[PDB]
């Protein structure tokens, strides 16, 4: 039960934390290009600040 609670439950809590952060890690890996795309509407909106 503990391994069921650990490997099949707690590791899925880790998984549901890892999967919820799986794209984070990819996004963290591609932090600048994700900023280049996911926040692409920042620099373009920055051009009209002045």
């Amino acid at each position: 039960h503990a391994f069921r609670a650990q490997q099949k439950y707690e590791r899925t809590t880790n998984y549901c934390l890892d999967l919820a952060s799986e794209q984070e890690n990819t996004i963290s890996d591609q932090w600048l290009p994700e900023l280049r795309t996911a926040v692409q509407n920042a620099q373009a909106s920055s051009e009209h600040c002045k």
Partner: peptide
């Protein structure tokens, strides 16, 4: 006894995926 009460914390996160 914790295979079901923990299921609302431990077993919802497996359910959460």
């Amino acid at each position: 006894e914790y295979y079901n009460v923990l299921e609302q914390i431990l077993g919802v996160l497996i359910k959460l995926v």
